[PDB]
Design a protein around this motif. Structure first.
Motif, short mmCIF file in Angstrom:
data_model
loop_
_atom_site.label_atom_id
_atom_site.label_comp_id
_atom_site.label_asym_id
_atom_site.label_seq_id
_atom_site.Cartn_x
_atom_site.Cartn_y
_atom_site.Cartn_z
N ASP A 120 0.82 -1.22 0.00
CA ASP A 120 0.00 0.00 0.00
C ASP A 120 0.84 1.26 0.00
OD1 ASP A 120 -2.55 1.56 1.25
OD2 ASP A 120 -2.42 0.22 2.95
N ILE A 121 2.17 1.20 0.16
CA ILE A 121 2.97 2.45 0.13
C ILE A 121 2.86 3.07 -1.25
CG2 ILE A 121 5.37 3.34 0.33
CD1 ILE A 121 5.84 1.21 2.45
N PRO A 122 2.69 4.39 -1.34
CA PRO A 122 2.59 5.06 -2.61
C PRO A 122 3.85 4.93 -3.44
CG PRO A 122 2.57 6.68 -0.83
CD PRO A 122 2.57 5.31 -0.19
N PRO A 131 14.85 7.68 -0.02
CA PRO A 131 15.12 6.83 1.11
C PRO A 131 14.46 7.27 2.39
CG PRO A 131 17.18 7.46 0.05
CD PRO A 131 16.07 8.13 -0.70
N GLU A 132 14.59 8.55 2.77
CA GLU A 132 13.94 9.02 4.00
C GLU A 132 12.42 9.04 3.87
OE1 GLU A 132 15.92 10.77 1.79
OE2 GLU A 132 14.53 12.38 1.29
N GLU A 133 11.85 9.20 2.67
CA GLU A 133 10.39 9.13 2.53
C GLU A 133 9.92 7.69 2.74
OE1 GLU A 133 10.10 10.75 -1.45
OE2 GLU A 133 10.19 12.80 -0.74
N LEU A 134 10.68 6.73 2.21
CA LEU A 134 10.36 5.30 2.44
C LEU A 134 10.39 5.03 3.95
CD1 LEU A 134 9.73 2.41 1.35
CD2 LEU A 134 12.19 2.07 1.16
N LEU A 135 11.39 5.55 4.66
CA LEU A 135 11.49 5.39 6.11
C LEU A 135 10.27 5.92 6.84
CD1 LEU A 135 13.28 4.33 8.37
CD2 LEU A 135 14.40 6.53 8.53
N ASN A 136 9.77 7.09 6.41
CA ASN A 136 8.57 7.64 7.02
C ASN A 136 7.43 6.62 6.94
OD1 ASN A 136 9.88 10.07 7.62
ND2 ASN A 136 9.11 11.10 5.78
N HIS A 137 7.26 5.96 5.81
CA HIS A 137 6.20 4.96 5.66
C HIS A 137 6.46 3.66 6.42
CE1 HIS A 137 4.72 7.55 2.38
NE2 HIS A 137 3.56 6.99 2.71
N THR A 138 7.70 3.19 6.45
CA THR A 138 7.97 1.96 7.23
C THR A 138 7.77 2.22 8.72
OG1 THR A 138 10.37 2.37 7.14
CG2 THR A 138 9.38 0.91 5.47
N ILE A 141 4.02 2.21 9.50
CA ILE A 141 3.51 0.85 9.58
C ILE A 141 3.89 0.22 10.91
CG2 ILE A 141 3.66 -1.45 8.54
CD1 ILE A 141 4.16 0.04 5.82
N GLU A 142 5.13 0.39 11.36
CA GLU A 142 5.54 -0.13 12.66
C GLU A 142 4.62 0.41 13.75
OE1 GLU A 142 9.56 1.20 12.80
OE2 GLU A 142 10.37 -0.79 12.36
N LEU A 143 4.45 1.73 13.76
CA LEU A 143 3.59 2.39 14.76
C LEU A 143 2.16 1.87 14.69
CD1 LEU A 143 1.68 4.85 15.67
CD2 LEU A 143 3.86 4.66 16.89
N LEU A 152 10.75 -3.10 10.80
CA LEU A 152 10.98 -2.96 9.36
C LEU A 152 12.28 -2.18 9.18
CD1 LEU A 152 7.38 -2.05 8.08
CD2 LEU A 152 8.47 -4.30 8.08
N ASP A 153 13.33 -2.84 8.70
CA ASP A 153 14.60 -2.24 8.47
C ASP A 153 14.93 -2.09 6.98
OD1 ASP A 153 14.95 -2.43 11.03
OD2 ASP A 153 16.77 -3.52 11.12
N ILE A 154 15.50 -0.95 6.62
CA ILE A 154 15.93 -0.83 5.20
C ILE A 154 17.32 -1.42 5.12
CG2 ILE A 154 16.37 0.74 3.29
CD1 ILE A 154 14.26 2.61 4.51
N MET A 155 17.52 -2.58 4.50
CA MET A 155 18.85 -3.19 4.44
C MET A 155 19.71 -2.52 3.38
SD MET A 155 18.27 -7.30 5.06
CE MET A 155 17.03 -7.58 3.85
N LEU A 156 19.13 -2.35 2.18
CA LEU A 156 19.79 -1.72 1.06
C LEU A 156 18.80 -0.81 0.29
CD1 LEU A 156 22.59 -3.15 1.00
CD2 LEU A 156 20.82 -4.95 0.99
N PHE A 157 19.30 0.24 -0.32
CA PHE A 157 18.44 1.14 -1.12
C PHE A 157 19.19 1.35 -2.43
CE2 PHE A 157 14.73 3.85 -1.16
CZ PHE A 157 15.03 4.71 -2.21
#
Ligand SMILES: Nc1ncnc2c1ncn2[C@@H]1O[C@H](COP(=O)(O)OP(=O)(O)OP(=O)(O)O)[C@@H](O)[C@H]1O
Ligand SMILES: C[C@@]1(CCc2ccccc2)Nc2nc(N)[nH]c(=O)c2N=C1CO
Ligand SMILES: [Mg+2]
Ligand SMILES: [Mg+2]
Length: 158
Positions: A27-29, A66-73, A76-78, A96-101
């Motif tokens: 569902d992330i844009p 990358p930081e916008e993806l983090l905002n969404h992950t 979801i955690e919250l 939810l961790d970003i391993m690689l971008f």
């Protein structure tokens, strides 16, 4: 860009948490899931007084920064009840961790990519290897080589 996300859960029915997280990730844009690894059951690394984890890895194609993806992950955690405190490695409903971008090397206060400890964690590297066996890190190290060399134990499935 292709981002690799690690998923971890050891509280409040981990299988339900991870299936819900997969739906929310889809569902992330400006993003869509490419592949999902198998679901693994792993003993805790670090503090041992906590339940076993369900660990998985997902490949996501996204045009978000990358930081916008983090905002969404983090949203979801919250949403799934994650409440963090500075004391870090305790049990959690969803991680939810970003391993690689893509092939980016990122070092900011909010985001360190590649994930700062992933080369030391079999529960991140095996699931990743299942979906991207020929992956090469931004520093030139090959994932297959790291696993073959370190002799990490193989993981059991959930
Ligand atoms: N690659 C990354 N993925 C996710 N969060 C990251 C990343 N790099 C840095 N962070 C930061 O880490 C903090 C969240 O970490 P978290 O509470 O979830 O730790 P953890 O995942 O339980 O432990 P660890 O990071 O050692 O694997 C946030 O401040 C987030 O900005
Ligand atoms: C809690 C920790 C600590 C990871 C850690 C290991 C060693 C030193 C510091 C932190 N352990 C985890 N174990 C499994 N199986 N699976 C996890 O997903 C996992 N995640 C962790 C924190 O992100
Ligand atoms: Mg995390
Ligand atoms: Mg983590």
């Amino acid at each position: 860009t292709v981002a690799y996300i690690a998923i971890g859960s050891n509280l409040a029915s981990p299988l339900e948490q991870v299936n819900a997280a997969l739906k929310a990730l889809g569902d992330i844009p400006e993003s869509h899931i490419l592949t999902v690894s198998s679901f693994y059951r792993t003993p805790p690394l670090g503090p041992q007084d906590q339940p076993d984890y369900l660990n998985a890895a997902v490949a996501l194609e996204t045009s978000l920064a990358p930081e916008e993806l983090l905002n969404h992950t983090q949203r979801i955690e919250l949403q799934q009840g994650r409440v963090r405190k500075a004391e870090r490695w305790g049990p959690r409903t969803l991680d939810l961790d970003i391993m690689l971008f893509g092939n980016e090397v990122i070092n900011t206060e909010r985001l360190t990519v590649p994930h700062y400890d992933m080369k030391n964690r079999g529960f991140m590297l095996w699931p990743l290897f299942e979906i991207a066996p020929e992956l090469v890190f931004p520093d030139g190290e090959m994932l297959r080589q790291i696993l073959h060399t370190r002799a990490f134990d193989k993981l059991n499935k959930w």
